[PDB]
Design a binder for this molecule. Structure first.
Ligand SMILES: C=C1/C(=C\C=C2/CCC[C@]3(C)[C@@H]([C@@H](CCCC(C)(C)O)[C@@H]4C[C@H]4CCC(C)(C)O)CC[C@@H]23)C[C@@H](O)C[C@@H]1O
Ligand SMILES: C=C1/C(=C\C=C2/CCC[C@]3(C)[C@@H]([C@@H](CCCC(C)(C)O)[C@@H]4C[C@H]4CCC(C)(C)O)CC[C@@H]23)C[C@@H](O)C[C@@H]1O
Lengths: 10, 239, 239, 10
């Protein structure tokens, strides 16, 4: 999914 | 025979990014779930690793070239290099004196026995301490350190990368900068760049050992509940 | 006109289960991520709610009848009643004096303003404080309390239950015990059972309000990363 | 999924 990783890369 | 303007920019950019993302005081550790000495230390280390991942991501966001990769590629590099960059940045806290990461008083001093109460094996912690000592002895400049980190992270041989050519192109430019730096700026390092690239091959074994033991943790639901959502995203296989 | 042997067993079993799962000292709170006063209190409350869910599950495991339900049914009741049982058990810490949950010193005293730094609205916190006051005033015996909790949890009208007849059969046996108890053991409570069943209808509104605001939290990845895997399993919709 | 809930119910 990677919802958080995407968020964390502005 | 002298560092170029573009090589100097890359060094400024990377050194700053490290400073912007590494608190040498370890002052935020009081926000983690306290360490305790049934996987006693696992809450605290999961918080520690989770916090670190956020600093690694912020560092990576500032490696020149990284932002322009696809978001898929950016995720692929992070998910695989994460634990490696952590072991790398964590060397700044490893003390040769007592052979432990020293991040505070008796509380945030992580010695070999504590990580055993975190689901990992005394037996496979051997190479990690060994890695940290040999790297401590390399007495790297902050430039060589930050450079080694960006090179580790930009390895095109990670599972998931699609543009393994652009990532390779970025990683070689960073190696050039490093060889130049050691060559024109680090006296006595006639053999240092090879010593540094050797450390990269070590990290892949560490990365491998950790993946086998973390899978054991994430497959037992009573231990994974102690992890953080970031940790489970990063070290899980949901790609 | 007198409690039966089977009704008395149900009360013993439930009172013990509560005692085995409610630390009146709140001594384990030092293990949670510290409270701070960008959703400042959210780490601490997520740890607080996560810890509570584990106590609720242990309580439920000991409500007679609960273990024999299918695992699907057991999960369905827990996932929907979780926040309700929490608001219910949390009344033991709510103090009428300062209108706040008092679980320690200045640290673990949760007053209305702190939960605002946890992603919830001052406006929709109104009914929760109101609920806690009206329940505090009901001056319930420990038996009526533990009984009300088991009744709340055994509601057959939860999304996901399959055997809504067995769960209904269990929940009525528990209401009988409660009406009996109040009737033969609680003087002056000629109107108390209705007052208690009213509190159950209130909890569904609270449950509803919380679901709308937690969905806002779980849809913003920077806030959900502060949650715990247990919290995300329980209040998420992965059924 | 509910891996944890299943575990937590012994
Ligand atoms: C992280 C940092 C710091 C310190 C970093 C430490 C010291 C404490 C122990 C840590 C966290 C190690 C373990 C990671 C556990 C994580 C979970 C449980 C999720 O698996 C590692 C698995 C073991 C052994 C290896 C092997 C057996 C081969 O797997 C990696 C980096 C280490 C301090 C400061 O310098 C900031 C820096 O960011
Ligand atoms: C939990 C306990 C205790 C105390 C329990 C508290 C006091 C602190 C605030 C808590 C945790 C409330 C909030 C839950 C937040 C959780 C996340 C962020 C995940 O949404 C609630 C959402 C708000 C308002 C309601 C409405 C607006 C209508 O949604 C529920 C129970 C409350 C103390 C002790 O007695 C043990 C007991 O187990």
């Amino acid at each position: 999914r990677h919802k958080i990783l995407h968020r964390l890369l502005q | 025979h002298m560092l170029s303007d573009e090589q100097m920019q890359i060094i400024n950019s990377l050194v700053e990014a490290h400073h912007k993302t590494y608190d040498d005081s370890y002052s935020d550790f009081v926000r983690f779930r306290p360490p305790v000495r049934r996987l006693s230390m696992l809450p605290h280390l999961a918080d520690l690793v989770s916090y670190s991942i956020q600093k690694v991501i912020g560092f990576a966001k500032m490696i020149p070239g990284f932002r322009d990769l696809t978001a898929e590629d950016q995720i692929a590099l992070l998910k695989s290099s994460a634990i490696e960059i952590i072991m790398l940045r964590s060397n700044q806290s490893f003390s040769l004196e007592d052979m432990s990461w020293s991040c505070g008083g008796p509380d945030f001093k992580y010695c070999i026995n504590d990580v055993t109460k975190a689901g990992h094996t005394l037996e496979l912690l051997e190479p990690l301490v060994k890695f940290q000592v040999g790297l401590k002895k390399l007495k790297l400049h902050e430039e060589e350190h930050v450079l080694l980190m960006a090179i580790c992270l930009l390895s095109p041989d990670r599972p998931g990368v699609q543009d393994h050519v652009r990532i390779e192109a970025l990683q070689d430019r960073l190696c050039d900068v490093l060889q130049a730096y050691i060559r024109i700026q680090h006296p006595g390092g006639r053999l240092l760049y090879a010593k540094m690239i050797q450390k990269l091959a070590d990290l892949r074994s560490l990365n491998e050992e950790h993946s086998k033991q973390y899978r054991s943790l994430s497959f037992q639901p009573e231990h994974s509940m102690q992890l953080t959502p970031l940790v489970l995203e990063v070290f899980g296989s949901e790609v």
